[PDB]
Amino acid sequence: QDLSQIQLRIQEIVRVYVDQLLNDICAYYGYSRFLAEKLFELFSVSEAVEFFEANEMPRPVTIRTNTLKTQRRELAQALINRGVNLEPIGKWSKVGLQVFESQVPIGATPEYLAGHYILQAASSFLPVMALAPQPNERILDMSSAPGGKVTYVAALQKNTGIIFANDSNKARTKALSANIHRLGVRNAIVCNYDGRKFPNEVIGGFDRVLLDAPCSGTGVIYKDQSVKTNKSERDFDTLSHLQRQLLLSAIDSVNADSKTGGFIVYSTCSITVDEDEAVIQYALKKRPNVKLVSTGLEFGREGFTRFREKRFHPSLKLTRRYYPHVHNIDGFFVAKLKKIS
Amino acid sequence: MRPLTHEETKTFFEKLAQYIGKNITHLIDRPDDPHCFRLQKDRVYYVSERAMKMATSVARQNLMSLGICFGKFTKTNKFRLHITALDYIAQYARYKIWVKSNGEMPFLYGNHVLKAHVGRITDDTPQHQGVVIYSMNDTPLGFGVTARSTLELRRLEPTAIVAFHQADVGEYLR
Amino acid sequence: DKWYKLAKEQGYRSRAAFKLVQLNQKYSFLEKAKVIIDLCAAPGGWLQVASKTCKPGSLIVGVDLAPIKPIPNCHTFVEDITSDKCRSQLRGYLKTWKADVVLHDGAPNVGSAWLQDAYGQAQLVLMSMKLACEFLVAGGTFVTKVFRSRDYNNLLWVFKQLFNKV
Amino acid sequence: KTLQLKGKLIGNALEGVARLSHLLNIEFLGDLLQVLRELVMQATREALLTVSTAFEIASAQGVGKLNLDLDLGLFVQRLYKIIFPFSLNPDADLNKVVNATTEMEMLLKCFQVFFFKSKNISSSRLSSFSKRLAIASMQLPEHSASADLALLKKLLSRYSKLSRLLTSEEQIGDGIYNPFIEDPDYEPFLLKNHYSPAVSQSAKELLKS
RNA sequence: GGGAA
RNA sequence: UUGUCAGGUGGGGAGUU
Structure with missing residues (x-):
């Protein structure tokens, strides 16, 4: 069928049928039926159409300036002198710069080589802000790769404290170590061990915990369109189980007696309800000593308390959810938990 | 992770010395933070005491990186194989030379600093001396061995060669 | 020659680009050129130098009859330099801003009398100088290429009355 | 001999040493800073003279050609540490030794020769x-x-x-x-x-x- | 050879 | 603080092939 005809049929179905709209969306966007049905169930019919349309639009390029090396104003001046159009990424982040046009390559610039700015998604910047690492504190990162979050955490800590970053894949670990060395992080220790065993087999008692658990890629459809058709129910269940295990290990490793506070920040790159809300509910039930706390983000949709037959705890609303159609950034879910004992 | 024995320490403590000279003293001792040298595989790692204390837990084979590398221990027992120490070498640098905008790109690609492309000098630079390369924005660039001296460099042919590239900031992503 | 070789080595399209950058170095009109209008911009050497010299986000417009390869943050208008339609387009992009510096590279073809080619360039300079005064702001700059001739003295005279400095 | 006795005339002794240092042999220049740096165990005032005279000796023209080194950084850190006791103790100019008097004058004088150092x-x-x-x-x-x-x-x-x-x-x-x-x-x-x-x-x- | 740049 | 248990690291040291 013609693409214009399919789009017109989808618009007519949205205006008014559900099966026809899903078939038209699958024909046009090429997404799998299961993924399209889950997205249609999660968001409104108009919201799902907007999310599907926004999934095709390429996200703007975002670069995080290393406060450890150069200031934001100096980086902007250097980018301007290099013939690259950059603007601040909203008001929530004071270092995030969005690049619209760049005559020279962004990653090959002298400042980029020097580590002044590192290319990273704006959503990744939010998890660092939610974690809010403090100087002279022990921060444990469950997923070191690609190192952007670790570099931001070290910059926030002003090269103080100890940042223990773990990466499961050796190939990704080597790149993360290279990025950390380029960024000049001095107190970062990179390990290659399982996150579940990390609380008990390697070390525990981290003052702060940042668990960027791997996601199905629902919010990273534009980056990796293969996940649209490679998503399976069994894979989603396995990812949810792995995320729950990682969250439990992070809670166990977090020291509630730490003077800086046992804060654990869990981040996911998918807007799936069963991946974000269910994992948070499972973690809360498994660890009564962990209580949800405000993420402190000025933007982001509140966590859903009731989705279809599934009902979440009232504290689940504190979670921050971002969507490409809502926040103009890659879909992500952020949850902050504080340990009491 | 393996503690460094005496021979490899004296084998690398001169290697620092052609670049930072006797400036290594602020590195090897610092009362605020007993942040000493550590060795994993053949890569010499400059880390804090707490870094070792956490690193004691992680396995030697598992732990691939720790703090800042100063270079691998080759068979001839020499370094510069990594430039990750550029920030420390630049700060404690005895001798720094500035390379103009024409000379930043051939250095950033690893070609040696041309005479016409030399911007500024320390004015007292011996032959075959370990020096540090800077840009106009006072930013470290890499390590270079200079076989030229200010005394004769002040009157030289542009296309001549002054400082040989050893490592550059481009290698971080190259 | 040597200048052609450096044009190929650096990526500059033609030696006339090196001519423009030297003028900017010796006069600094392009550095302060918030709005630059490029008459006879083909093949694009003048446009590239104007884009590089001017601070990014400037009002860069290059109009020439020959097609010009696209350049970021630059409007390549493939029309006559002084056409009524292109003049509408230049003022359409000009809006509240006003033309600050204008570059002109009018080049008639060779193969006829030198006096014909000299006057062909001079008239095209004057007739392009017409659009300048139409679009130029007070204190503006007009850099144009001219062929020396007997009418060159007259052209300088018109330049002296219509501009403060030559 | 005056330096050995460590009397109150150390001021004039360092005055003469700084003035006549350029007249002495090169080998003595390297050993001249050793006696200055060996007196670190009016104590703050004396340490000010030693670091200032050490700067003056290194300020001799052509030391770049005569690369005697000697790592005057030990004097640099001495000046870096000596400012706090100077801020602690009182000072009065009253009204109407390197080269002058009024201890605050050397400090700015050591700072200005420090600034006058070429790109140091x-x-x-x-x-x-x-x-x-x-x-x-x-x-x-x-x-x-x-x-x-x-x-x-x-x-x-x-x-x-x-x-x-x-x-x-x-x-x-x-x-x-x-x-x-x-x-x-x-x-x-x-x-x-x-x-x-x-x-x-x-x-x-x-x-x- | 002159005049002008 | 001081002691107890469990875990990690461990060609550092000791012992087996």
């Missing part, structure tokens, strides 16, 4: 030195306070974070390091409130400039 400073080391200079500027007459702030005012370096949060304060530390900050954002705020009214306007002229 302003490599992020001057700012660390200047921070404690502002800290030591909490007392002493305003004309002295204005003088040291004027040194960085006329400084060729464009660094502006000296009077605020600054890079790592290494070399004996004992101060806020603030490592890896790089923020163009303390002492002048409290300096505004001070006995002499003109210190307030001096602080105002600094922040406006």
Whole structure:
């Protein structure tokens, strides 16, 4: 069928049928039926159409300036002198710069080589802000790769404290170590061990915990369109189980007696309800000593308390959810938990 | 992770010395933070005491990186194989030379600093001396061995060669 | 020659680009050129130098009859330099801003009398100088290429009355 | 012999040593700083003379050609540490030794010869030195306070974070390091409130400039 | 050879 | 603080092939 005809049929179905709209969306966007049905169930019919349309639009390029090396104003001046159009990424982040046009390559610039700015998604910047690492504190990162979050955490800590970053894949670990060395992080220790065993087999008692658990890629459809058709129910269940295990290990490793506070920040790159809300509910039930706390983000949709037959705890609303159609950034879910004992 | 024995320490403590000279003293001792040298595989790692204390837990084979590398221990027992120490070498640098905008790109690609492309000098630079390369924005660039001296460099042919590239900031992503 | 070789080595399209950058170095009109209008911009050497010299986000417009390869943050208008339609387009992009510096590279073809080619360039300079005064702001700059001739003295005279400095 | 006895005439002895050092042999120049640096165990005043004369000896023309080295950094850190006791003890000019008197005069004199050194400073080391200079500027007459702030005012370096949060304060530390900050954002705020009214306007002229 | 740049 | 248990690291040291 013609693409214009399919789009017109989808618009007519949205205006008014559900099966026809899903078939038209699958024909046009090429997404799998299961993924399209889950997205249609999660968001409104108009919201799902907007999310599907926004999934095709390429996200703007975002670069995080290393406060450890150069200031934001100096980086902007250097980018301007290099013939690259950059603007601040909203008001929530004071270092995030969005690049619209760049005559020279962004990653090959002298400042980029020097580590002044590192290319990273704006959503990744939010998890660092939610974690809010403090100087002279022990921060444990469950997923070191690609190192952007670790570099931001070290910059926030002003090269103080100890940042223990773990990466499961050796190939990704080597790149993360290279990025950390380029960024000049001095107190970062990179390990290659399982996150579940990390609380008990390697070390525990981290003052702060940042668990960027791997996601199905629902919010990273534009980056990796293969996940649209490679998503399976069994894979989603396995990812949810792995995320729950990682969250439990992070809670166990977090020291509630730490003077800086046992804060654990869990981040996911998918807007799936069963991946974000269910994992948070499972973690809360498994660890009564962990209580949800405000993420402190000025933007982001509140966590859903009731989705279809599934009902979440009232504290689940504190979670921050971002969507490409809502926040103009890659879909992500952020949850902050504080340990009491 | 393996503690460094005496021979490899004296084998690398001169290697620092052609670049930072006797400036290594602020590195090897610092009362605020007993942040000493550590060795994993053949890569010499400059880390804090707490870094070792956490690193004691992680396995030697598992732990691939720790703090800042100063270079691998080759068979001839020499370094510069990594430039990750550029920030420390630049700060404690005895001798720094500035390379103009024409000379930043051939250095950033690893070609040696041309005479016409030399911007500024320390004015007292011996032959075959370990020096540090800077840009106009006072930013470290890499390590270079200079076989030229200010005394004769002040009157030289542009296309001549002054400082040989050893490592550059481009290698971080190259 | 040597200048052609450096044009190929650096990526500059033609030696006339090196001519423009030297003028900017010796006069600094392009550095302060918030709005630059490029008459006879083909093949694009003048446009590239104007884009590089001017601070990014400037009002860069290059109009020439020959097609010009696209350049970021630059409007390549493939029309006559002084056409009524292109003049509408230049003022359409000009809006509240006003033309600050204008570059002109009018080049008639060779193969006829030198006096014909000299006057062909001079008239095209004057007739392009017409659009300048139409679009130029007070204190503006007009850099144009001219062929020396007997009418060159007259052209300088018109330049002296219509501009403060030559 | 006068230095060995460690009497009250050490002032004139260092005066002569600095004046006549360039007349002596090169080999003696290297060993001249050893006697200056061996007296570290009016103690602050004497240490000021040793570091100032060490700067003067190294200030001799052509030391670049005669690469005697000798690592005067030990004197540099001595001056870096000696400012705090100078700020602690009182000083009075009354009214109507390197080269002059009035101890505050050498300090600025050592600072200005330090500034006069060709590219030896302003490599992020001057700012660390200047921070404690502002800290030591909490007392002493305003004309002295204005003088040291004027040194960085006329400084060729464009660094502006000296009077605020600054890079790592290494070399004996004992101060806020603030490592890896790089923020163009303390002492002048409290300096505004001070006995002499003109210190307030001096602080105002600094922040406006 | 002159005049002008 | 001081002791107890469990875990990690461990060609550092000791012992087996």
